[PDB]
Amino acid sequence: QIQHIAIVGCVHGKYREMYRQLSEYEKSTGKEISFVICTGDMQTLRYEADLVYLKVPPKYKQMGDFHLYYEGKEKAPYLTLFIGGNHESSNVLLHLYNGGFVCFNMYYLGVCSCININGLRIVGVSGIYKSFDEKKPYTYPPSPNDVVSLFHTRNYVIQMLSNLSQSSQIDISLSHDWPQGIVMKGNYKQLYRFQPGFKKDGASLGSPINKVILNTLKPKYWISGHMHCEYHAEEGPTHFIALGKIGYKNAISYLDLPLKQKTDLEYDKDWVCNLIMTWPAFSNKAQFPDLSYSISELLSKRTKELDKKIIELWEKYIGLKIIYDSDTFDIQFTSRRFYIEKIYNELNI
């Protein structure tokens, strides 16, 4: 039993072309796409005003196609899961830092998270690495000045995600920039012939945060974008796949994986417990996470009886299935935090 998953590199606002490409493959080969995974640079600009939050060179200050899907003019034909890259409507993603649908069939995984679909556990890490921002908190509501920093990956995602392969393996992990040093684990000589600009970076190319997460979780697959080129490599048991940008040949590939059972997009139980147990570090909605707390210390208080009660209350107030909600994004920010706070306090810890 087989499922076919499309994996996409950078989209840069070219959604109609991406779905056209994807519908072609469905018609040409007769295979059915279960769902789509995109590794970032999604540019989910709702309308003109969101352009202030898109950090691009001036020639790329363009709306793209997403507003068509946001308005309902277009309908995304497949469920599309994505992380954020360095070219985003960063204000929208911060409202949805705990994940959410930006429009029908288009689900943002958040700053980081794990989801369940078709028996698979999928971990996403948004953004790109800059050492000088990796300790900065998020400030909310988003203001135009943070356009330059909102999409930089924070070190704290390492502690949020590190326990996630205790119960079971991670099937797929996504990141926008490559895990640092993985460039050396494939045919880099051939890669340097197509991208001679990479050679000077050596093994330091890529994000150290993603390197750590890769080494800790060892997913079956790690997918990244951002470098506008195809690449493959193997780090121990992990198959690494880098993808190009929509418009070129190397932008889309497909994973044909065993389908254990067909199952709708669901929240991951272990992620949900991590989210509830770290609530104290996130409780100040003007600035989070409060790193005076230890994320690891907070997560060390997880127990099997608390996990069971957390998932019971999550199913009650939110539900295990991830379902489309068309409230505005600032309301979704407040609502999801309202139930995390409520669930935590009901634990009396």
Next chain:
RNA sequence: GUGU
């Protein structure tokens, strides 16, 4: 990597 259209990366500061």
